[PDB]
């Protein structure tokens, strides 16, 4: 297995953004740098923002504040890719889990954006013994 | 090879297989590149290898040698001294 | 000046002959043709659009009407398909019909696919071997899945009213 | 071809197959324009002369009246006098 | 009729009922000169009559069977009008290069829409409105 | 093979079948390593040379670009100049 | 640099052509390919 | 036979067929016990020496290593020096 | 004719056909009934009818003349005075 | 033919095929009335003498007892003494 | 022997079989090792053994003697004094 | 069994249940001498069992498929018993000239009526009444 983490490179996305809007990378506006931070390298978001910009070069900041909003319902593009939007992709993943598992994920919702929590706390919220708890997470 | 020449070789089948002298043609068919060395051997070994069988296989294979197959064939006939046969064929193609 | 040959290729293609009462639009035809020339090889889609009744089809017919761009550029024949507006079932038939049209020899199975994708395979394969230098022209087209169906990776140019239609598709678009 | 023609062929197709050699006859019919090269190769490709004759005759049966006369003239011209005699009845 | 020496084309002939309209069509082609030099392709006559959509369909298949005497083309017959249109166009294009098609009657446009093979077809009738859907020179 | 290659074959496969003799061409393609013995027997087994040619061509169409050039060289080497000329377009 | 031939094999295969707006990931592609 | 042997044959089978005369070579191979009488008649029965050579070579290719050396010695012994030279590579 | 003899005549093909003198054998092959009169003429007419071609056809046909074909052949060689050839063949069959 | 006859043939049909020449034997048979010209050509048409012998024997096996004796006499008369000896058992 | 030389010997068949003098060549073909002693006798015994039949068999066997078969053949022609024949062949191979 | 050297003929073998009736049938043919000289045709065994009219029909088709290994005869199978009888008789007559058929059990006459091909078939059983419908020498 080769495992692709969703990251990308800040240098690369600028490369991608330039292609999307067709300008020397430096010629790119000050706004551009910040939105990529939001993107977090999900090239789907970059293409999704990028195409979205092809139509409306003027409304550049708008989407910046939009991703600052944190809602992805605003961003949509018809694309070769099979979904209107990034929110659209995640919904497809969630459904599959067996009903017993499915409830648990939501509890998983509370956890910080960037905390590696020690397994135990998950044991406590679940109230379910540790040897068992790890496997569902696996 | 166009239909006129193919049709001509068909209508003239008898006269040809009755009159063709192949013994001295071999080298001219090769020298003029009408046929390839391998096909020439195939023709000489046709059927019982009789003059007629060879002559018949020669004129059948001729259809597969391109647009200049007939006039090239006629040239080989002439340098072999088969003037009446060459004449008949020429008069026919020229009757146009 | 139409070559006699051009008409012979065109007849096989099935494009309509231009209305007797027509008036060239040299600049426009020239632009499509020069652009049309652009995808010299490798897949590619061209979209043409206007408010209703802008000469959109006639130009498509007219552009290919000329010998120079078509003959040197397009060893493959031209095939025209009249897509119209279609429910999923209706679309299916056009595909089979294009299957029957393209396979004149009949070497390929007389049986026709009951599945859209299989028809997509027959098109791609037929375009790839039987006639790849071929260009396909479409008429109208009102929804994306339609071009999804025709998305053979072989050049197809769709002429229409919506320009949104060719968004599902992949490859260079002009 | 004519009924009497087609039937005369059928009536004697066995005696014919048991004696005739196809190559010379096909040379004539090809020249007359009543036999094609492909047809000629199908006949020639047969394993035995009885089958070649059989194939030729099989083909001639579906042909026009002129082919019946072409085959008849060929037989005569080729020395199959008695067999041409038997077919004289047919046209 | 001689005029469309090549390239598609439609001819309409019309009169109040019983004006000799068919007989002329039969008679015009009856002659050797115009037909033989002009028309290396054979002449095919179709009796269209008046038809509901289903009825029209059969005539097409029947013309398919008629034209393809060799049977090289698929024995299976199209269930779709357009496919029959393809078989006609293709057959006219290759199988019978110089052919002329004559029609009898004809009472509605979609009908000629069906026969609109881009290959000369001449329709003889009562309404002259009928050949308005069609494209190409009309006399 | 290439689109233009495959298409060039299809565009002239009829003229080819109507003239070419497969044995010599298969000797070349076998030597070049672009035709197998089994493939060769399937072609040879055909009843008529038009079908043998047809089978060969049917096979070559599903082959790589090098086979298109092997077939083209064979045609030239075997005297089918005009037909090789027609295929020059293809690659 | 795509070879002309590569595209010919690929067309037969039916893999989609890469989006016009793409950016190689050399390390990743290299890893999959070597693996 | 060996890969290099079989391949050396294939690499030069054309130059061989275009020159060699089978009878003398088959006398040697028969004597050596690497060719049978039947095999010998199949080769001899071929219409042209190019096909006889071709048939011989066709047969030798499916034979053991010793037959490759028998054929090589025969060529030398028979004056086919240059062709034996080309095969020296093979074993 | 057993396999041992069928192989011995093959391994010695050269030394045989490349040494065999057939001119004076004809009558002995007939007189000893090794071959039948019609086969004898087939052998004499083999190929170009050259001594070698005749000799080659003779030794090939020999395989079809039964178990005593070889020792009978050897006897014909001896009464023809071909002692070295007869000797070589004998020593080989006797090497058992 | 008889069981022992048919079997004796089968028991030695291999040794026979590996040695006998059909033409002389068919001359004898064709005269005895146990072989037809057609049968004779099918046998003669075979590519190798082993197949000709094989075809002849294949045919004789479906024949009457007299054909077994005709074939046996032919073998003797033609010099195939040892093979006639082996068949003496059969009738 | 390459195709150019094989084709040259084919195109030139008539001139060769009409002009070749073999009586004094035998020893030169042997002395230069163009042919082996066994083949030389095969050639001399070709057909009716007529000068023409011998000459024809010689030039056919020549194709099987390697790359230097022709220039070696030309050398034998020259030491035999057949200068016009040697000249014609040389001019042809040199026409490259 | 040797006795019907040629021309149709039926052999019946019988005993109270489990008397070695089949094994003998298998054993008798097991030997080379009687089979090889006598029977140039191969031996075909059919396991008839006990059958309603419909069931019997299938066995026949199956014997049809078995006997015609070449498939030269129509791939289509008869829907009528008699037609199968024809395929058997014809196949026995030409395809397998010297063949012997063995049957297992058999409990009613129409069954042998079905197999009554005029070609030797031997039935081995419990009732000896069964081969009374049949015609030809019986032992
Ligand atoms: N030279 C000409 N160029 C363009 N249109 C012409 C010309 N001469 C006449 N016309 C008229 C007659 C036709 O009805 C019409 C051409 O139709 P077209 O431009 O193909 O419409 P369209 O197919 O784009 O409509 P839709 O969008 O409904 O498909 O314009
Ligand atoms: N020489 C002639 N020319 C024309 N009509 C003739 C002639 N002789 C007799 N008639 C009569 C007999 C026919 O019934 C009739 C010819 O029919 P036709 O003119 O084809 O009518 P039609 O087919 O136009 O009618 P419809 O419009 O109902 O199809 O005229
Ligand atoms: N050498 C033998 N001969 C006969 N039977 C044997 C032998 N050895 C073992 N057996 C036993 C085992 C078998 O089950 C049985 C042979 O079955 P078989 O005689 O064919 O019965 P059957 O087939 O006549 O019964 P049914 O009448 O029910 O068909 O006898
Ligand atoms: Mg439109
Ligand atoms: Mg009317
Ligand atoms: Mg039982």
Automatic annotation (TrEMBL), chains B, I, K:
Which species is the source of this protein? Answer: Homo sapiens
Every copy of the CARD domain together lies at: 1-92
Mark the transmembrane ranges. Answer: none
Q: Which residues form a coiled coil?
A: none
The entry's protein name is Caspase-9
Phylogenetic lineage: Eukaryota, Metazoa, Chordata, Craniata, Vertebrata
Q: Please state the span of the N-terminal signal peptide per the UniProt entry.
A: none
- What is the similarity comment for this entry? Belongs to the peptidase C14A family.
Q: Briefly state the protein's biological role.
A: Involved in the activation cascade of caspases responsible for apoptosis execution. Binding of caspase-9 to Apaf-1 leads to activation of the protease which then cleaves and activates effector caspases caspase-3 (CASP3) or caspase-7 (CASP7). Promotes DNA damage-induced apoptosis in a ABL1/c-Abl-dependent manner. Proteolytically cleaves poly(ADP-ribose) polymerase (PARP). Cleaves BIRC6 following inhibition of BIRC6-caspase binding by DIABLO/SMAC.
């Amino acid at each position: 297995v080769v495992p692709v983490e969703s990251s990308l490179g800040k240098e690369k996305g600028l490369e991608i953004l330039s292609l999307f809007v067709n300008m020397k990378k430096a010629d790119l506006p000050e706004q551009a740098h910040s939105i990529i931070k939001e993107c977090k390298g999900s090239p789907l978001v970059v293409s999704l923002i990028g195409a979205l910009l092809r139509d409306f070069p003027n409304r550049w900041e708008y989407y910046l504040k939009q991703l600052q909003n944190k809602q992805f319902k605003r961003i949509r593009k018809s694309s070769s890719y099979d979904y209107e939007a990034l929110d659209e992709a995640m919904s497809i993943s969630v459904e599959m889990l067996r009903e017993d598992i499915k409830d648990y994920y939501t509890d998983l919702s509370i956890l910080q954006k960037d905390v590696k929590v020690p397994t135990k706390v998950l044991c406590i919220l679940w109230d379910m013994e540790t040897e068992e708890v790890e496997d569902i997470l696996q | 090879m166009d239909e006129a020449d193919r049709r001509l070789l068909r209508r003239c089948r008898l006269r040809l297989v009755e009159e063709l002298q192949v013994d001295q043609l071999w080298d001219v068919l090769l020298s003029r590149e009408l046929f390839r060395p391998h096909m020439i051997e195939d023709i000489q070994r046709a059927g019982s290898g009789s003059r007629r069988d060879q002559a018949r296989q020669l004129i059948i294979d001729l259809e597969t040698r391109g647009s200049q197959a007939l006039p090239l064939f006629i040239s080989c006939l002439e340098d072999t001294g088969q003037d009446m046969l060459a004449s008949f064929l020429r008069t026919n193609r020229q009757a146009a | 000046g139409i070559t006699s040959y051009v008409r012979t290729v065109l007849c096989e293609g099935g494009v309509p002959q231009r209305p007797v009462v027509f008036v060239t639009r040299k600049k426009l035809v020239n632009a499509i043709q020069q652009k049309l020339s652009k995808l010299k090889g490798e897949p590619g889609w061209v979209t043409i659009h206007g408010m209703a009744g802008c000469g959109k089809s006639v130009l498509a017919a007219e552009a290919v009407r000329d010998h120079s761009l078509l003959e040197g550029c397009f060893p493959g024949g031209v095939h025209w398909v009249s897509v119209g507006k279609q429910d999923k079932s209706g679309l299916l038939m056009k595909l089979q019909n294009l299957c029957t049209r393209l396979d004149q020899d009949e070497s390929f199975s007389q049986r026709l696919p009951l599945n859209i994708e299989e028809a997509k395979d027959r098109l791609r394969i037929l375009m790839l071997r039987k006639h790849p230098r071929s260009l396909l022209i479409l008429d109208d087209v009102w929804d994306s899945w339609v071009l999804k169906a025709f998305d053979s990776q072989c050049q197809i140019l769709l002429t229409t009213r919506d320009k949104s239609v060719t968004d599902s598709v992949m490859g260079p678009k002009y | 071809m004519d009924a009497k023609a087609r039937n005369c062929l059928l009536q004697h197709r066995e005696a014919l197959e048991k004696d005739i050699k196809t190559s010379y006859i096909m040379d004539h019919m090809i020249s007359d324009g009543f036999l094609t090269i492909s047809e000629e190769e199908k006949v020639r490709n047969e394993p035995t002369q009885q089958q070649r004759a059989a194939m030729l005759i099989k083909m001639i049966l579906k042909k026009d009246n002129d082919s019946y006369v072409s085959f008849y003239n060929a037989l005569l011209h080729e020395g199959y006098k008695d067999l041409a005699a038997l077919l004289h009845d047919g046209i």
